[PDB]
Amino acid sequence: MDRENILKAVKEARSLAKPRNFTQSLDLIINLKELDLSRPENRLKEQVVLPNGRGKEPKIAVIAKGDLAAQAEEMGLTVIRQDELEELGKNKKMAKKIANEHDFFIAQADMMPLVGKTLGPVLGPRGKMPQPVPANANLTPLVERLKKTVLINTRDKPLFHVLVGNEKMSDEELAENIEAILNTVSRKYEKGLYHVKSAYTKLTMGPPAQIEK
Template sequence: MAEKPTVMAVQKALESAKKRNFTETVELAINLKDVDLTIPKNRIQEDIVLPSGRGKSVKICVIGGGELALKAKDVADRVITPEELGAIADDKKQAKKIANDTDYFIAEAPLMAVVGKRLGTVLGPRGKMPKPIAPGADPAAMIEGLRKSVTIRSKDRKTFHAPVGSADMSAEEIAENIDLILKRVESHLEKGKYNIASAYVKTTMGPSERVL
């Protein structure tokens, strides 16, 4: 049976990439057409749980206190208590470092307004505003989902990128992730796939292969 076009493109991208002494990320570049992204409602931002996962560690930070902080201690990469929040917000250098080092933030729902006010200028432009969670809830399931997730975000540019796996994953696994992302991107566009000019897959430092 013939390989699917996406699988073939991923296979080519993986094979044509030089061997590195680290595991490269595999990225998807999507180019849109006939979409006015200066209009905010036309922009795309969505978290997608990838069927084959990211193939690399995804860092999660939980902002909250009490029971939530206790439950998050063993499953999150970092926990910021309400008491620590102010000190971090006042130290812009530290706030930026945490924002850059963290893939996703989760915050106790009553703290969302405070987080927005104190850290919004750092997290907002990076598309990393926290996802709310009920006080005292067990964050394990949410964290597990986020560890397999990727954020697609077009901002105001017609070309945007998303990680779709790592070079040590199989071409089939990466292709499965790509097909789902393209399907979700299409669902946000007025003309669906006809608003996608092209899509390319590549390893971080390797040549790109056309997927669409």
């Protein structure tokens, strides 16, 4: 899992991927070996800020009110104010829709029990429960980080995928994105990257090419 060998598997995944009428994204498949995923201390669940971003920007919703919601409308983010949160509670159709349409949710801190009550049946099963920020937080740092945030999640199984980017990125960029994920498996566990049995790269409709080591 050294650079020149990630760069090689990124290149072999591209070359083997028959071109399509959309920009295919590159997925990383990690196989974990020797770990007990019945103990939660061994389950990886991290937010990694990829250095080079993630291909298309993720849609972000801001459940707030006041200045914090004045900033998000300004940034062009989807704003769900308190009033609109109450109606969404009565309407499970419109609630599964906002959830399946946004990648990340940010809620104003004090609105979280009210989001727990109203949108909670939706986002919680979906894993999109909002990240709380102070009522006076500046959303610009936060939204910057989140535009390049993906989420490693083993749940209970020795296997996971993470998107590391798309076709329109260089091999070098996708190398440093994959290396940013691997450096995280390595940081968690004390034997390090010994728990990576095999690791593959793949385009959306490409074949998978394993990273040599």
